[PDB]
Amino acid sequence: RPRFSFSIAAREGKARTGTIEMKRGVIRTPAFMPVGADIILGNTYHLMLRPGAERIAKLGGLHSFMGWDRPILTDSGGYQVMQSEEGVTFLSPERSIEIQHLLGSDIVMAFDECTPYPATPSRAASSMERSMRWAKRSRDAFDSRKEQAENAALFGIQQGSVFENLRQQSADALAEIGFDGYAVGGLAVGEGQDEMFRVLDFSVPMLPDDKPHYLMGVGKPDDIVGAVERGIDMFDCVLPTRSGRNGQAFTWDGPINIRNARFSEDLKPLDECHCAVCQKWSRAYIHHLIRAGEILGAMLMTEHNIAFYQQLMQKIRDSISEGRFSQFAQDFRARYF
Amino acid sequence: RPRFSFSIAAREGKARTGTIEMKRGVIRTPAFMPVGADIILGNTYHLMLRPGAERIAKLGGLHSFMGWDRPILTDSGGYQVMQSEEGVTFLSPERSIEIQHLLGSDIVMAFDECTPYPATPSRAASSMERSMRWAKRSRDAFDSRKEQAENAALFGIQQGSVFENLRQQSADALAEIGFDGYAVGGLAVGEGQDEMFRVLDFSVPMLPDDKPHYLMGVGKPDDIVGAVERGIDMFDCVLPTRSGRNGQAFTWDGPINIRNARFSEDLKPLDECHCAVCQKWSRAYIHHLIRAGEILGAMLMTEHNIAFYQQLMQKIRDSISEGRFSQFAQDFRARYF
Ligand SMILES: [Zn+2]
Ligand SMILES: [Zn+2]
Known part of the structure; x- marks a missing residue:
């Protein structure tokens, strides 16, 4: 190159x-x-x-x-x-x-x-x-x-x-x-x-x-x-990585604070997300790890947020390439907010 | 089964x-x-x-x-x-x-x-x-x-x-x-x-x-x-995981405190160790991450210690199976101390 x-x-x-x-x-x-x-x-x-x-x-x-x-x-x-x-x-x-x-x-x-x-x-x-x-x-x-x-x-x-x-x-x-x-x-x-x-x-x-x-x-x-x-x-x-270290996860439905008691029995993955965390673990378990002060929790959260950001960028690239970025933006916004 | x-x-x-x-x-x-x-x-x-x-x-x-x-x-x-x-x-x-x-x-x-x-x-x-x-x-x-x-x-x-x-x-x-x-x-x-x-x-x-x-x-x-x-x-x-969270790594040469300034320019991996951390990163870089307060550092250290313990158990199993456990123990001891 x-x-x-x-x-x-x-x-x-x-x-x-x-x-x-x-x-x-x-x-x-x-x-x-x-x-x-x-x-x-x-x-x-x-x-x-x-x-x-x-x-x-x-x-x-x-x-x-x-x-x-x-x-x-x-x-x-x-x-x-x-x-x-x-x-x-x-x-x-x-x-x-x-x-x-x-x-x-x-x-x-x-x-x-x-x-x-x-x-x-x-x-x-x-x-x-x-x-x-x-x-x-x-x-x-x-x-x-x-x-x-x-x-x-x-x-x-x-x-x-x-x-x-x-x-x-x-x-x-x-x-x-x-x-x-x-x-x-x-x-x-x-x-x-x-x-x-x-x-x-x-x-x-x-x-x-x-x-x-x-x-x-x-x-x-x-x-x-x-x-x-x-x-x-x-x-x-640094938001993905700070957020990861403070309990907040990005999802297509908006950010969530996983430490909230609402997640303690939530068996859904953090987010659609293809990431490895989302391939294997529930909100309930990551909630547990973070409330427990375990490093793994912080780790899983960060990995998820990093991957979320890259999936967002991939969606943006594909939609511009396909001529549907305008629609993607509106749909993104509808769901995220 | x-x-x-x-x-x-x-x-x-x-x-x-x-x-x-x-x-x-x-x-x-x-x-x-x-x-x-x-x-x-x-x-x-x-x-x-x-x-x-x-x-x-x-x-x-x-x-x-x-x-x-x-x-x-x-x-x-x-x-x-x-x-x-x-x-x-x-x-x-x-x-x-x-x-x-x-x-x-x-x-x-x-x-x-x-x-x-x-x-x-x-x-x-x-x-x-x-x-x-x-x-x-x-x-x-x-x-x-x-x-x-x-x-x-x-x-x-x-x-x-x-x-x-x-x-x-x-x-x-x-x-x-x-x-x-x-x-x-x-x-x-x-x-x-x-x-x-x-x-x-x-x-x-x-x-x-x-x-x-x-x-x-x-x-x-x-x-x-x-x-x-x-x-x-x-x-x-819990030693592998506590140790991991406190700067100490197990090696065949004994435990090391990776935060010590002696490791700041050490390009060797943490340990012989076949682990993934040891496949890719230096003592110097993990030293850096931990001194920086990065979660990744803590993560890499823990992964290493867990893997070290399993490699030790595998060495013990093989040596007993092969009839050389007595010698392994003596050699282990010689080097570890
Ligand atoms: Zn995910
Ligand atoms: Zn290793």
């Missing part, structure tokens, strides 16, 4: 389905990228602290460390961290790119500033302006490392808060630098779904149509369906 | 290897019985409290509840609980047998009193005497339930503390009642390995040779090898 190639196989409205080809593998889009599926996320911020990026490189890089030979995406670390034009003390475009290089990730994120919400126009603009200068610094640092430039890909991240004119300026800046893909940053920071969708309505068409669009940090199943409706191709969120 | 049949295929010293045939499956001996492998343990005490034995029966019994169709052993619940000749308030021979019937277990334990350590002769004797009367009550209650009598098996439990003459009286009493198998109770209660082995040296030959011998609550890998040397056929212990 090539270093990076994105091809769109089918469309419905603003929605797209296709593939990203990379040296380590093919990623079907729209894609859900679970935390460390066709691609997983590494935790740059944690990893730079323990055991350190250099120690990971000493151990062979993140693929060999975690035994995952497929692509890996890493964030640039600042979201998590959060200050001067140089970067942040507690990281800078150059160091962030270096760390991601040492980790050996396949998709590298530019070092940006995730603007707080709410933000005034002036603050959002100052912030987005710094992020675009850091984006150029990120590009140059990436390009200066041969192994990285030739084997990895770099995504730029749009900022601008909820302001159309700043989103436009940011998209323009990013397209002028040039990236392999374009993330929509600065959302899923407490604005609520209606506002997020409003910003996505005008923001995603500003990005190059022929490159992947990544919505960082999103989200709930209904957030993902709505974002795909608005042209997003890639997603990440 | 028959309700219960124990056959001894090979011997070396006091050590034996063979099989127990039951309706739900064959159990290779010496056997390690992990908590809910050829057989697993259910948690009578927990289950009677949540969701209740009747609720489990309502849900189809423990096999269907936990999705395990192979044999299941349950303890009688008092060990865990801990008072009159009737039983204990907080359970009695009859209620204990009823609960185990509702749970649908294949191997049922008599309701006994696990004598505290240390015990004076008089106290040990009074206690063992009550246990033998409860053993007879257990037998009668078991035999009164047709489905149980015809499909399950009942083991009696020897008491008597560390006193030879009381162990003898107890063995005599149990053999006069008649059981499918004989457990050695009252050990692994703080006496230490030298004292446990001393009691086992005289206590196991007192039991019927042609029935299985179960040492309840044992134990560490070296405890198991020594007990098999002394004629024990079956073991249970």
Whole structure:
């Protein structure tokens, strides 16, 4: 395969389905990228602290460390961290790119500033302006490392808060630098779904149509369906894994809190779900394990949620390919809510 | 298969290897019985409290509840609980047998009193005497339930503390009642390995040779090898699963605490071990997951320890079958310590 190639196989409205080809593998889009599926996320911020990026490189890089030979995406670390034009003390475009290089990730994120919400126009603009200068610094640092430039890909991240004119300026800046893909940053920071969708309505068409669009940090199943409706191709969120660790399971009928006493005699599987948990165990038994404090319970729940998310993405891909994504979205919504 | 049949295929010293045939499956001996492998343990005490034995029966019994169709052993619940000749308030021979019937277990334990350590002769004797009367009550209650009598098996439990003459009286009493198998109770209660082995040296030959011998609550890998040397056929212990949840892994070189900083760059697998964890991941990565508080780490550790214990039992069975168990024990010991 090539270093990076994105091809769109089918469309419905603003929605797209296709593939990203990379040296380590093919990623079907729209894609859900679970935390460390066709691609997983590494935790740059944690990893730079323990055991350190250099120690990971000493151990062979993140693929060999975690035994995952497929692509890996890493964030640039600042979201998590959060200050001067140089970067942040507690990281800078150059160091962030270096760390991601040492980790050996396949998709590298530019070092940006995730603007707080709410933000005034002036603050959002100052912030987005710094992020675009850091984006150029990120590009140059990436390009200066041969192994990285030739084997990895770099995504730029749009900022601008909820302001159309700043989103436009940011998209323009990013397209002028040039990236392999374009993330929509600065959302899923407490604005609520209606506002997020409003910003996505005008923001995603500003990005190059022929490159992947990544919505960082999103989200709930209904957030993902709505974002795909608005042209997003890639997603990440810890919700499946946090939820798993807190008693909540995703189902096509909505999320359920399995610890509730209502499940204590429920012999149905958690969800339709083809997952292995759902192949063998009842709500009643997972309820029991979790109430008992057993690790297995937490484990089964997480496995289920991860699999649910991938089944959702597969349903989304198939429905766009078949020209029935609009109907799927409506039916999804009817049942989930 | 028959309700219960124990056959001894090979011997070396006091050590034996063979099989127990039951309706739900064959159990290779010496056997390690992990908590809910050829057989697993259910948690009578927990289950009677949540969701209740009747609720489990309502849900189809423990096999269907936990999705395990192979044999299941349950303890009688008092060990865990801990008072009159009737039983204990907080359970009695009859209620204990009823609960185990509702749970649908294949191997049922008599309701006994696990004598505290240390015990004076008089106290040990009074206690063992009550246990033998409860053993007879257990037998009668078991035999009164047709489905149980015809499909399950009942083991009696020897008491008597560390006193030879009381162990003898107890063995005599149990053999006069008649059981499918004989457990050695009252050990692994703080006496230490030298004292446990001393009691086992005289206590196991007192039991019927042609029935299985179960040492309840044992134990560490070296405890198991020594007990098999002394004629024990079956073991249970939560150590693999507790240990897993606390950072400790069993290896042929002894246990290791994976959280120790010494493992942070160790690319070797946890252990020789054929397990799936050891097939794919390094000490360094499991160290990382556990230090990170990730459930996966705890999970991988537990899976490893369970598999280690079953590999140990397989090595023990093979070596007795091949007439080299004596040598295996010495080599085991050399390396483990
Ligand atoms: Zn499922
Ligand atoms: Zn292993």
